[PDB]
Amino acid sequence: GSSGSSGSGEKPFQCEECGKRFTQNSHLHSHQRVHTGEKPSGPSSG
Numbered sequence: 001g002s003s004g005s006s007g008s009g010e011k012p013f014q015c016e017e018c019g020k021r022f023t024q025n026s027h028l029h030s031h032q033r034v035h036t037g038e039k040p041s042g043p044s045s046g
C-alpha cells in the first residue's frame with residue numbers, strides 16, 4: 001500500500017510511470033515507449 005514508485009531522485013528529467021532518471025530529455029521522452037499503450041487524448045486532473 002505504501003508509496004511504490006518513488007519520485008525522489010537527482011536528475012531533473014524523471015519519468016511519470018517509473019520515475020526513472022536520465023541526463024537528457026530525449027532519452028526520457030523516447031524512454032516513455034516502454035510504457036506504450038496509455039494514449040490520453042485529454043489532459044489529466046491528478
Ligand SMILES: [Zn+2]
Binds near residue numbers: 017031032
Ligand atoms: Zn519510464
